Amino acid sequence: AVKKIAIFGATGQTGLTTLAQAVQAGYEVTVLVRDSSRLPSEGPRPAHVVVGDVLQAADVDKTVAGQDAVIVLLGTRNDLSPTTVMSEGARNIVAAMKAHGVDKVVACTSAFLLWDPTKVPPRLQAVTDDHIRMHKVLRESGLKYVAVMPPHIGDQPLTGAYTVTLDGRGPSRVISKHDLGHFMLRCLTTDEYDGHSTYPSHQY
Ligand SMILES: NC(=O)c1ccc[n+]([C@@H]2O[C@H](COP(=O)([O-])OP(=O)(O)OC[C@H]3O[C@@H](n4cnc5c(N)ncnc54)[C@H](OP(=O)(O)O)[C@@H]3O)[C@@H](O)[C@H]2O)c1
Ligand SMILES: CCC1=C(C)C(=O)N/C1=C\C1=NC(=C\c2[nH]c(/C=C3\NC(=O)C(C)=C3CC)c(CCC(=O)O)c2C)/C(C)=C1CCC(=O)O
Numbered sequence: 001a002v003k004k005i006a007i008f009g010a011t012g013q014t015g016l017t018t019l020a021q022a023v024q025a026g027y028e029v030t031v032l033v034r035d036s037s038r039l040p041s042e043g044p045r046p047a048h049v050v051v052g053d054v055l056q057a058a059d060v061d062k063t064v065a066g067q068d069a070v071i072v073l074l075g076t077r078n079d080l081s082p083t084t085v086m087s088e089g090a091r092n093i094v095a096a097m098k099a100h101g102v103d104k105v106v107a108c109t110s111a112f113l114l115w116d117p118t119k120v121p122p123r124l125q126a127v128t129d130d131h132i133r134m135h136k137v138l139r140e141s142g143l144k145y146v147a148v149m150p151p152h153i154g155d156q157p158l159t160g161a162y163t164v165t166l167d168g169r170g171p172s173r174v175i176s177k178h179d180l181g182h183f184m185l186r187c188l189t190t191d192e193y194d195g196h197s198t199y200p201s202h203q204y
Pocket of ligand 2: 076077078109110111128150153173
């Protein structure tokens with residue numbers, strides 16, 4: 001079973017609660033963060049903190065070494081500019097996984113990669129193009145990859161009661177950040193989504 005995990009993007013909206021949940025659930029968690037002041041003091045704390053950048057291969061390598069699995073919650077916060085941060089980060093993550101024998105990655109992109117790809121709002125198209133490059137990197141890696149493709153990420157409570165479909169259709173177009181993190185952790189204990197795209201959603 002998975003015991004040790006690396007989380008990328010642990011200081012973001014979904015990352016923070018995924019990290020807290022993972023520690024509370026018993027995982028030994030390593031995070032890569034550019035700025036450690038973005039980690040909280042209260043609540044559950046990661047076992048290991050690497051300060052650095054997902055665009056630096058050595059930093060990623062140090063974070064992936066010795067892990068059982070990797071969670072990817074990289075994003076651009078409010079920046080909608082053309083970008084390759086997520087896909088280049090994923091390239092480094094894949095190389096570090098292969099260098100260290102790690103074979104399980106659960107990574108978040110977005111439901112736009114399931115929905116009609118001509119239905120993306122213009123201001124999200126640049127970020128979505130890099131999600132598509134990241135998804136390609138991970139699908140072509142030869143590793144066990146769960147693609148998590150959520151709809152709008154909300155702040156509703158943790159429920160653990162959301163629905164997961166494989167095609168982008170579901171009870172709603174929202175998932176709470178807490179439920180999304182819960183689902184990323186669920187993917188560590190089953191192979192049933194390996195090689196699949198998944199759509200978590202719930203009516204809150
Ligand atoms: N918002 C929505 O409704 C929605 C819906 C579906 C999919 N998504 C996608 O879901 C994913 C998760 O979104 P989120 O809102 O939880 O993310 P977020 O709040 O944007 O957080 C992005 C995370 O990535 C880290 N990061 C960015 N650049 C990095 C770099 N060069 N090196 C290391 N770490 C870096 C950020 O670190 P810092 O703390 O250092 O900035 C932060 O931890 C994103 O890809 C987003 O596009 C969002
Ligand atoms: C109608 C409800 C709604 C809303 C008021 C939003 O802000 N997004 C949204 C719905 C969705 N956003 C999605 C993806 C998304 N949002 C986002 C963030 C921003 N939206 C913005 O306007 C700005 C500015 C953002 C950046 C700060 C992304 C890039 C993340 C990033 O780079 O920002 C991505 C990818 C997605 C699959 C949705 C369907 C779910 C549904 O309910 O249909």
